[PDB]
Amino acid sequence: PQITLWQRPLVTIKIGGQLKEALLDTGADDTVLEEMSLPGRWKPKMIGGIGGFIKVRQYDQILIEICGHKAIGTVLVGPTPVNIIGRNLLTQIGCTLNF
Amino acid sequence: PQITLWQRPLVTIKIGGQLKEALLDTGADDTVLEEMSLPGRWKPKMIGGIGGFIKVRQYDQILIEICGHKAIGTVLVGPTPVNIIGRNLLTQIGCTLNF
Ligand SMILES: *[C]C1(*)(*)([C](*)*)S[C]([C](C(=O)[N][C]C2=[C][C]=[C][C]=[C]2)N(*)[C@](*)(=O(*)*)[C@@](*)(*)C2(*)(*)(*)(*)=[C@](*)(*)C(*)=[C]C(*)=[C@@]2(*)*)[N@@](*)(*)[C@@]1(*)C(*)(*)(*)(*)(=O(*)*)N(*)(*)(*)C(*)(*)(*)(*)([C@@](*)(*)C1=C(*)[C@@](*)(*)=[C@@](*)(*)[C]=C1*)C(*)(*)(*)(*)([O])[C@@](*)(*)C(*)(*)(*)(*)(*)(=O*)[N@](*)(*)C(*)(*)(*)C1(*)(*)=[N@@](*)(*)C2(*)(*)(*)=C(*)(*)(*)([N@@]1(*)*)C(*)(*)(*)(*)=[C@](*)(*)C(*)=C2*
Numbered sequence: 001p002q003i004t005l006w007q008r009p010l011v012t013i014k015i016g017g018q019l020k021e022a023l024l025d026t027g028a029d030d031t032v033l034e035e036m037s038l039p040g041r042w043k044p045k046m047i048g049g050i051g052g053f054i055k056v057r058q059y060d061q062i063l064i065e066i067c068g069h070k071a072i073g074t075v076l077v078g079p080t081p082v083n084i085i086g087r088n089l090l091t092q093i094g095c096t097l098n099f
Numbered sequence: 100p101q102i103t104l105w106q107r108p109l110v111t112i113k114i115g116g117q118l119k120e121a122l123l124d125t126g127a128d129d130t131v132l133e134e135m136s137l138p139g140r141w142k143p144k145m146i147g148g149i150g151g152f153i154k155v156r157q158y159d160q161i162l163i164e165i166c167g168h169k170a171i172g173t174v175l176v177g178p179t180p181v182n183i184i185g186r187n188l189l190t191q192i193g194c195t196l197n198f
Binding site: 001002003004005006008009023024025026027028029032047048049050051052053054067069080081084087090091093094095096097098099 | 100101102103104105107108122123124125126127128131146147148149150151152153166168179180183186189190192193194195196197198
């Protein structure tokens with residue numbers, strides 16, 4: 001698809017059975033989901049942004065589906081205000097920025 | 100141009116006869132620049148990010164050129180880790196997300 005930025009670029013993801021809304025975000029290096037339960041072991045991590053840093057759990061090799069496209073990679077889970085798809089999975093579905 | 104997201108989408112902007120680097124960020128509603136001096140009067144604004152809220156200054160009608168495309172609009176100044184080009188100016192240069 002081609003997406004305009006007059007509104008926020010929100011999409012439906014499928015994440016282990018659940019459907020969610022998420023933000024396609026080129027300014028995020030990583031994908032960060034709101035607090036949820038994932039299968040697997042994890043590592044703590046700190047990520048920072050506007051307003052400072054938060055602690056997240058790092059999960060590896062999670063399959064996500066972003067508009068039909070499935071992608072695999074690292075997912076961070078934590079007290080983010082919104083679900084965010086970052087550059088790590090955007091690349092996997094062939095996302096580019098165009099003008 | 101078409102930008103891929105394997106690296107950060109950093110570009111050069113020009114504001115006030117200075118060149119600076121900035122991130123193209125579709126996850127940002129507005130444009131936020133590191134601490135600097137702009138023309139005119141400002142008003143107060145609060146923005147929320149990953150880590151919390153910050154208080155910024157809002158200057159209206161600023162000209163930026165981004166990659167040789169010039170835009171005029173609202174820019175916020177405050178303590179951001181990087182200069183950020185958000186959706187208000189990304190729409191003015193015709194930027195879309197594609198996959
Ligand atoms: C996405 C987000 C987080 S969300 C926010 C927004 C919304 O929607 N909401 C909330 C609010 C409310 C009220 C008020 C305000 C807010 N908003 C917006 O958009 C506003 C703004 C503008 C500009 C800026 C900011 C804000 N928010 C958002 C954000 O924050 N985003 C971001 C930006 C940035 C970039 C860079 C730096 C800083 C910031 C993005 O997009 C994402 C992020 O966060 N990034 C950073 C990072 N992250 C991560 C990293 N880094 C690494 C790793 C992982 C993750």
